[PDB]
Amino acid sequence: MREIVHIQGGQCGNQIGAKFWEVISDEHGIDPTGTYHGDSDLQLERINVYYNEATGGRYVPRAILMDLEPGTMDSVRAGPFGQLFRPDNFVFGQTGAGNNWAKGHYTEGAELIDSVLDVVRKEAEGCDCLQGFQITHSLGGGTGSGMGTLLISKVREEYPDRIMETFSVVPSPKVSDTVVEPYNATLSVHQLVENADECMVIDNEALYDICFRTLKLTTPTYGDLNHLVSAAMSGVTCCLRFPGQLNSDLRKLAVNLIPFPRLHFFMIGFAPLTSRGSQQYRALTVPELTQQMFDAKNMMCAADPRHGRYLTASALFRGRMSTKEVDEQMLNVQNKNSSYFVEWIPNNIKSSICDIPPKGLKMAVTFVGNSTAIQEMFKRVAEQFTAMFRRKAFLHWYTGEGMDEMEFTEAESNMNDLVSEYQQYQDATA
Amino acid sequence: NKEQIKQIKSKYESCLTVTNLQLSLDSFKPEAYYYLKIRNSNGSHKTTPQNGGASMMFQGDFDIYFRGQKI
Amino acid sequence: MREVISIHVGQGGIQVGNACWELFCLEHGIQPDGQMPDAFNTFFSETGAGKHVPRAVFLDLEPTVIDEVRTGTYRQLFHPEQLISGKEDAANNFARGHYTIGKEIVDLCLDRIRKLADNCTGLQGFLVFNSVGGGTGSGLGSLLLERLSVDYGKKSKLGFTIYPSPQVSTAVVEPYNSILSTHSLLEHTDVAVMLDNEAIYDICRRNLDIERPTYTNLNRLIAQVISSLTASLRFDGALNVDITEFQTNLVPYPRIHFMLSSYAPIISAEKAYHEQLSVAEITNSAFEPANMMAKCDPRHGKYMACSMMYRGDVVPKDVNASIATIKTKRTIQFVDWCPTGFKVGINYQPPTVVPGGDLAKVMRAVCMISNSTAIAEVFSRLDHKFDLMYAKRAFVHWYVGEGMEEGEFSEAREDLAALEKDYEEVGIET
Amino acid sequence: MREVISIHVGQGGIQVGNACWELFCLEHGIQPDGQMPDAFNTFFSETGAGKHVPRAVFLDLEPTVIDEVRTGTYRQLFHPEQLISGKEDAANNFARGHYTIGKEIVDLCLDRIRKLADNCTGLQGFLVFNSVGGGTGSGLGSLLLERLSVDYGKKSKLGFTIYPSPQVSTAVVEPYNSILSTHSLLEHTDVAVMLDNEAIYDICRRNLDIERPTYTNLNRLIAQVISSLTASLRFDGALNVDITEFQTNLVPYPRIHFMLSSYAPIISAEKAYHEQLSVAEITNSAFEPANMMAKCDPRHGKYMACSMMYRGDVVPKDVNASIATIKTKRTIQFVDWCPTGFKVGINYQPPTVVPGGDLAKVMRAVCMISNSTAIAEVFSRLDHKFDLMYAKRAFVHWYVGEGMEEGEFSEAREDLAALEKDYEEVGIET
Ligand SMILES: Nc1nc2c(ncn2[C@@H]2O[C@H](COP(=O)(O)OP(=O)(O)OP(=O)(O)O)[C@@H](O)[C@H]2O)c(=O)[nH]1
Ligand SMILES: Nc1nc2c(ncn2[C@@H]2O[C@H](COP(=O)(O)OP(=O)(O)OP(=O)(O)O)[C@@H](O)[C@H]2O)c(=O)[nH]1
Ligand SMILES: Nc1nc2c(ncn2[C@@H]2O[C@H](COP(=O)(O)OP(=O)(O)O)[C@@H](O)[C@H]2O)c(=O)[nH]1
Ligand SMILES: [Mg+2]
Ligand SMILES: [Mg+2]
Structure with missing residues (x-):
């Protein structure tokens, strides 16, 4: 019951899913052949959340994979746990977008999306009670940031009451791999605010910083960043698949973390994270988890959370632990940092406990906090956008496929209005 | 004429008809003849040569067919 | 496909x-x-x-x-x-x-x-x-x-x-x-x-x-x-x-x-293995003006956008750590209306060696395709060479007698003048 | 029988x-x-x-x-x-x-x-x-x-x-x-x-x-x-x-x-096996004007009906997929009063090779028998050749002295004129 379907688009989203599904399968004891080989009874009670049942007793994820080029899905199939995905759900084009947002949203993405919407509708109509959808995509690419966001609007138009999740990677100015990143980032943020019920920003720069400083491993690769993102993704829905002292589905988090409908851009972090050589030194206790949870360097975004004030915060503890300690520590982390918490909403931290810890760990915490410090990312994105747009650089590529500069002006104005009205509440006082 | 026009309209995106060409130069040689060569990427037309004078008037209808650049 | x-x-x-x-x-x-x-x-x-x-x-x-x-x-x-x-x-x-x-x-x-x-x-x-x-x-x-x-x-x-x-x-x-x-x-x-x-x-x-x-x-x-x-x-x-x-x-x-290209490293087997060929040093060598594949000086003009490909065992974090160093240097300056100008690609297959050739076998290589404002010098010098002989109409009879019109030479000169004016107009700051 | x-x-x-x-x-x-x-x-x-x-x-x-x-x-x-x-x-x-x-x-x-x-x-x-x-x-x-x-x-x-x-x-x-x-x-x-x-x-x-x-x-x-x-x-x-x-x-x-015929493929054993001889390419070669078995240009006239025979291991769906491509092309146009003009035959026996001959052994072949309006040119040129010598009654004495009447030449001319008028009358659209 109350299950969700997985939809991913683009190369970055496909690579994120290729590790997210591996993590989920390892958590539920599903072999790469789709056969259950788990140890505990609880591993099968709520498997309908992510997995479907077919004849022969094997399980198949309800994931939908879409891209405008076939290479990435032809590569993910040969990887581990690549056989679980149903071949029918693979939809792809023969041309690609070339990191051009217009091509992936107006000319090419519009004709292809009917086929993927057909299978999306097939998956949603069938399921017992829908909880919602979760979306993984990147804002630094053309086909992803175009087709995914248009699909968001199409899904929202047909299921207005369901919940919608988006895990979005925004292009940081530090590690830049594409010159046209500001254009399709700014165009995508315009559409994303209007339809997504929840959005979670993730930055490659913050992932590299975490890998270099906390884990202290010499050579980070995309596999480590994907693993961290996958652990963070799994931590959110853990209590929906396992029993606990205070169950809290996604809708309950939506109620408690979004004060106003347009303020739904969160930054997350996962604890504990320790190096291989120091994993024996540390002792896992609730104070040790909560001190690392609120650490500024532990956030999955380069945004500095002590440059603003938290509107609200959430924590999803895992493992068996006493609730009194959790509540007193949450109170203590809020009394010692009163300057960084907005004062006109008292008791702005939500907590939840799940009795099933991750495989290999005795305690774990997932942190989701809505803070005013996120304005800095939109500020720098808009700064680069307005630095590049004033000369109409690279504009002809977009304008040759039916798009105009008016949609750029409206997007810039709406993004600046969002930036302004997000900080409006930072200076608000009672 | 209809089939030729249909073949022309199938090959080209537009036509420009140029008429009444008046040449004025800062200096003419009185003993020299002048003609205009009207050209695009698809072909060229030539006027009849006329004797040099302070203004020369070349008569003719010059149909210039385009497939891209309108120069 | x-x-x-x-x-x-x-x-x-x-x-x-x-x-x-x-x-x-x-x-x-x-x-x-x-x-x-x-x-x-x-x-x-x-x-x-x-x-x-x-x-x-x-x-x-x-x-x-x-x-x-x-x-x-x-x-x-x-x-x-x-x-x-x-x-x-x-x-x-x-x-x-x-x-x-x-x-x-x-x-x-x-x-x-x-x-x-x-x-x-x-x-x-x-x-x-x-x-x-x-x-x-x-x-x-x-x-x-x-x-x-x-x-x-x-x-x-x-x-x-x-x-x-x-x-x-x-x-x-x-x-x-x-x-x-x-x-x-x-x-x-x-x-x-x-x-x-x-x-x-x-x-x-x-x-x-x-x-x-x-x-x-x-x-x-x-x-x-x-x-x-x-x-x-x-x-x-x-x-x-x-x-x-x-x-x-x-x-x-x-x-x-x-745009003009460059490649690195270029080294013979007699002295290749004595040095480690780190990614930082190869990406520094690729940007050296003396290693341009066309005889133009990049120090005489601004950069517009740099697209540069890696192949081998290179890790993205090492690439970012080297892009930062290049942005740091004072001898390489980008155009004002381009905050980020790098597009990065990473591939796993190392370059192959041809037997009896000059290049040795290495595990890392970098190829850059860079668009810069300094390219106008080759156009200017070719134009100067053209004008010297076109002043006296030398060698023109070899072209007029092969069906080409007399005026066809002038419009190419006008288009080169237009291109040179455009390159100057783009490179000025706002 | x-x-x-x-x-x-x-x-x-x-x-x-x-x-x-x-x-x-x-x-x-x-x-x-x-x-x-x-x-x-x-x-x-x-x-x-x-x-x-x-x-x-x-x-x-x-x-x-x-x-x-x-x-x-x-x-x-x-x-x-x-x-x-x-x-x-x-x-x-x-x-x-x-x-x-x-x-x-x-x-x-x-x-x-x-x-x-x-x-x-x-x-x-x-x-x-x-x-x-x-x-x-x-x-x-x-x-x-x-x-x-x-x-x-x-x-x-x-x-x-x-x-x-x-x-x-x-x-x-x-x-x-x-x-x-x-x-x-x-x-x-x-x-x-x-x-x-x-x-x-x-x-x-x-x-x-x-x-x-x-x-x-x-x-x-x-x-x-x-x-x-x-x-x-x-x-x-x-x-x-x-x-x-x-x-x-x-x-x-x-x-x-x-009507005039064509055949494909025609190729020697020295270079036949280097290419796959798919059905699409052979059916394209058969319709090439340069491969007509009679020296007439089909581009000068409309088609009336095409009967074309295959033999070998050809599959009907591949034949239909190639008839569609030919209907697509703009250089081949059929007469107005004929919506479909293709009759297709498929046989299993591959063409046999004669030892010491020119043609090589292949598994697929196509033979077309096509009726087109362009055939009137051969009649017109033969008529023009006939008129030149019949104007002066040259070589007629070799025919009159073998029992044929004088007027027998004229009525053949009238029948050819009738045929040429009929071919023009049929080819006009309604
Ligand atoms: N990089 C490189 N340039 C070459 C090579 N061969 C010729 N060129 C250049 O080509 C220029 C002349 O054109 P070619 O390619 O030699 O001759 P072409 O293009 O066939 O033109 P034709 O003279 O009409 O046959 C010379 O100025 C050379 O610089 C080569 O092997 N490598
Ligand atoms: N395709 C082809 N045409 C041929 C061949 N032999 C003759 N012809 C053509 O036949 C025409 C003349 O007719 P023939 O067949 O040679 O002689 P005939 O039909 O027996 O008539 P007579 O001269 O009275 O014997 C020539 O113009 C040739 O083009 C042949 O072997 N193959
Ligand atoms: N975490 C992670 N990020 C990736 C991976 N591959 C690419 N990216 C990011 O995705 C961005 C490029 O997105 P792109 O591949 O063009 O998306 P697309 O246009 O939808 O295919 C780069 O800035 C990378 O930082 C990966 O395997 N893992
Ligand atoms: Mg030559
Ligand atoms: Mg004979």
């Missing part, structure tokens, strides 16, 4: 095509007979049982080079009737190969192009190679580009032209046809890469330590650059780049698409 | 009959002696024990060719008294072979035809071969057709006439008898196929790469076309076609039954 077709016209084009086609056959394990004793599909096609046929066509009016090809070790590889050959050479006369003898040959080439294109299903684009300072090369390249631009339309075409050196020259009349061909491909080619011989001679002398190089050594380096550019289409990589993802990242405006 | 009788008259007719009768004997496994060391019944008859006798008759007034036949390796095959031979040649005079010496021979031929027909039980129709530009060929063909049209009535007769080339000619008087024979067979033959020599010479030169062809090479291609046409009667196929199923599909009106 992704394909590309390479066009070779003229003596220089055929001699660099031979150079790239030993390298591709060696890299995909195909013997010179065409027989193997799913990545080949980008350049080759399967015949059903046994041999592979290249997706390439060789053009020339002068039969000597084609006859040399049809008797060498590669006689069995190419299809017998795609090596189109003429009888009479254009003899460095541009008007000949554009108006007199090229027209009767161009129809067969277009028929061959159609017969090759109907086989491909996912055609990415075309590649073309031609030495600019020759009659048949420049003239037939211009005519083929003009026919293809209307037969196919929006398909992407890439041109690896070899402009004459600043002072070193083999002919005496090459500025005329160089200017005319630049006129022709200015409005007809999506990408043009600079390849003059003097810079590559200096590269060989300084790094490879060869004091008597021949054309084969130059062509092998060009072939390596081509392989590095197209590796991302036929090998798995952490950060892929497609051909269609260029005009959205390197071409700010439709007129400006001339 | 299905039979067909082939008639060979004249030197060209006998020389193409020899060419087809090596091929049939080779295809059915019969040795040149006539002895095998149930499909043969279409062309042959069983004698009770041992040898097979062809259902063919050879006619000529000049004895040299028949004497050559009766001494070659095939002396034992044909029945001794069906090789009817005369004593005096007509010497390119049409009036001779229609009024003077052909009448005394035609009775024996008709007796032989009756003796062959009484043996057959399921007679499909007659085949006739005759080179038009000769006296005995055209005259005896006309007389035989006129006798058969009244002796048998509704039985179908097919004529594989060889008209003279546009400019290449062997005689000087062949337009006269060509026009007269066209007059004679216009109202007497159900199907006429164009076969002029110049087009087949060009085919051999371009594809077979033979620079010095002889008549045997031409006759082998004609024999292959005949075998492809009649394969459906003696081999199992997924989509069969009978001879009687032609005037219902290719002949819109009783007057219009002249």
Whole structure:
């Protein structure tokens, strides 16, 4: 019951899913052949959340994979746990977008999306009670940031009451791999605010910083960043698949973390994270988890959370632990940092406990906090956008496929209005 | 004429008809003849040569067919 | 399901095509007979049982080079009737190969192009190679580009032209046809890469330590650059780049698409292994002005956008840590309206070595394609060379008597003046 | 229980009959002696024990060719008294072979035809071969057709006439008898196929790469076309076609039954196997104007109906997918009052190869019989050639003195004018 379907688009989203599904399968004891080989009874009670049942007793994820080029899905199939995905759900084009947002949203993405919407509708109509959808995509690419966001609007138009999740990677100015990143980032943020019920920003720069400083491993690769993102993704829905002292589905988090409908851009972090050589030194206790949870360097975004004030915060503890300690520590982390918490909403931290810890760990915490410090990312994105747009650089590529500069002006104005009205509440006082 | 026009309209995106060409130069040689060569990427037309004078008037209808650049 | 077709016209084009086609056959394990004793599909096609046929066509009016090809070790590889050959050479006369003898040959080439294109299903684009300072090369390249631009339309075409050196020259009349061909491909080619011989001679002398190089050594380096550019289409990589993802990242405006390339490392086996060849040092060497593949000084102008490809065991974090260092340096400055200008690609397959060649085997390499404002100097010097002889109308009778009009020389001069004004207008800050 | 009788008259007719009768004997496994060391019944008859006798008759007034036949390796095959031979040649005079010496021979031929027909039980129709530009060929063909049209009535007769080339000619008087024979067979033959020599010479030169062809090479291609046409009667196929199923599909009106043929592929063993010979490429090659078996340009006129035969391992869906592509092309346009114009036949038996010949062994082939409006050009040029000499009454005395009336030339001219007017009247849209 109350299950969700997985939809991913683009190369970055496909690579994120290729590790997210591996993590989920390892958590539920599903072999790469789709056969259950788990140890505990609880591993099968709520498997309908992510997995479907077919004849022969094997399980198949309800994931939908879409891209405008076939290479990435032809590569993910040969990887581990690549056989679980149903071949029918693979939809792809023969041309690609070339990191051009217009091509992936107006000319090419519009004709292809009917086929993927057909299978999306097939998956949603069938399921017992829908909880919602979760979306993984990147804002630094053309086909992803175009087709995914248009699909968001199409899904929202047909299921207005369901919940919608988006895990979005925004292009940081530090590690830049594409010159046209500001254009399709700014165009995508315009559409994303209007339809997504929840959005979670993730930055490659913050992932590299975490890998270099906390884990202290010499050579980070995309596999480590994907693993961290996958652990963070799994931590959110853990209590929906396992029993606990205070169950809290996604809708309950939506109620408690979004004060106003347009303020739904969160930054997350996962604890504990320790190096291989120091994993024996540390002792896992609730104070040790909560001190690392609120650490500024532990956030999955380069945004500095002590440059603003938290509107609200959430924590999803895992493992068996006493609730009194959790509540007193949450109170203590809020009394010692009163300057960084907005004062006109008292008791702005939500907590939840799940009795099933991750495989290999005795305690774990997932942190989701809505803070005013996120304005800095939109500020720098808009700064680069307005630095590049004033000369109409690279504009002809977009304008040759039916798009105009008016949609750029409206997007810039709406993004600046969002930036302004997000900080409006930072200076608000009672 | 209809089939030729249909073949022309199938090959080209537009036509420009140029008429009444008046040449004025800062200096003419009185003993020299002048003609205009009207050209695009698809072909060229030539006027009849006329004797040099302070203004020369070349008569003719010059149909210039385009497939891209309108120069 | 992704394909590309390479066009070779003229003596220089055929001699660099031979150079790239030993390298591709060696890299995909195909013997010179065409027989193997799913990545080949980008350049080759399967015949059903046994041999592979290249997706390439060789053009020339002068039969000597084609006859040399049809008797060498590669006689069995190419299809017998795609090596189109003429009888009479254009003899460095541009008007000949554009108006007199090229027209009767161009129809067969277009028929061959159609017969090759109907086989491909996912055609990415075309590649073309031609030495600019020759009659048949420049003239037939211009005519083929003009026919293809209307037969196919929006398909992407890439041109690896070899402009004459600043002072070193083999002919005496090459500025005329160089200017005319630049006129022709200015409005007809999506990408043009600079390849003059003097810079590559200096590269060989300084790094490879060869004091008597021949054309084969130059062509092998060009072939390596081509392989590095197209590796991302036929090998798995952490950060892929497609051909269609260029005009959205390197071409700010439709007129400006001339850029100059560089490669690193270039080193011989006698002293290669004594140093570690870290990613930082190779990416520093790639940006050195003395390692430009065209004899132009980047210190004389701004950068617009840099697209640079890695291959081997490089890790993205090391790439970011090196892009930061380059942004730090005061001798390299980017244009004002471009905050980020780097597009990064990472591939896993290390560069392959050709036996008996110059380059050694290494695990890391970098190839950069950079668009800079300093390129206007070559246009200015070619224009100055052209004006000297066009003042007295020298050598014009060799062109007027081959069907070309008198005024055709002036409009190429006007287009070059327009291009030079445009390059100055773009490079000024706001 | 299905039979067909082939008639060979004249030197060209006998020389193409020899060419087809090596091929049939080779295809059915019969040795040149006539002895095998149930499909043969279409062309042959069983004698009770041992040898097979062809259902063919050879006619000529000049004895040299028949004497050559009766001494070659095939002396034992044909029945001794069906090789009817005369004593005096007509010497390119049409009036001779229609009024003077052909009448005394035609009775024996008709007796032989009756003796062959009484043996057959399921007679499909007659085949006739005759080179038009000769006296005995055209005259005896006309007389035989006129006798058969009244002796048998509704039985179908097919004529594989060889008209003279546009400019290449062997005689000087062949337009006269060509026009007269066209007059004679216009109202007497159900199907006429164009076969002029110049087009087949060009085919051999371009594809077979033979620079010095002889008549045997031409006759082998004609024999292959005949075998492809009649394969459906003696081999199992997924989509069969009978001879009687032609005037219902290719002949819109009783007057219009002249059509021109083409064949594909035509390729030598030296370069045949390097390419895959897919059905799409062969069906594209068959529609190429340069591969017409008669020197006429199909681009100058509309199509009326296309009947095209396949043989080998071709699958119907691939045929449909290729008919769609041809309907797509803008250079091939059909007449307005014909929405669908294709009749498709598929057979399983691949074409057989003759040892020492030109063509190689292939698994797929296509033969098309297409009726088009462009055929009027050959009639117009033959008419123009005729008028030039008929203005001064040249060479007429050679015809008036052989019993023909003066006015007989004019009415053939009037019938050609009527045919040309009819072809113009049909091709206009409604
Ligand atoms: N890099 C490189 N350049 C070459 C090579 N061969 C010729 N060139 C250049 O080509 C220019 C002249 O054009 P060519 O390619 O030699 O001759 P072409 O293009 O066939 O034109 P034609 O003279 O009419 O035959 C010279 O200035 C050379 O610089 C080569 O092997 N490598
Ligand atoms: N395709 C082809 N045409 C031939 C061949 N032999 C002759 N012809 C053509 O036949 C025409 C003349 O008629 P022929 O067949 O040679 O002679 P005929 O039909 O027996 O008439 P007579 O001259 O009276 O004997 C010439 O113009 C040739 O083009 C041949 O072997 N193959
Ligand atoms: N975490 C992670 N990020 C990736 C990976 N591959 C690419 N990216 C990011 O995705 C961005 C490029 O997105 P792109 O591949 O063009 O998206 P697309 O246009 O939808 O295919 C780069 O800036 C990378 O930082 C990966 O395997 N893992
Ligand atoms: Mg040459
Ligand atoms: Mg004869």
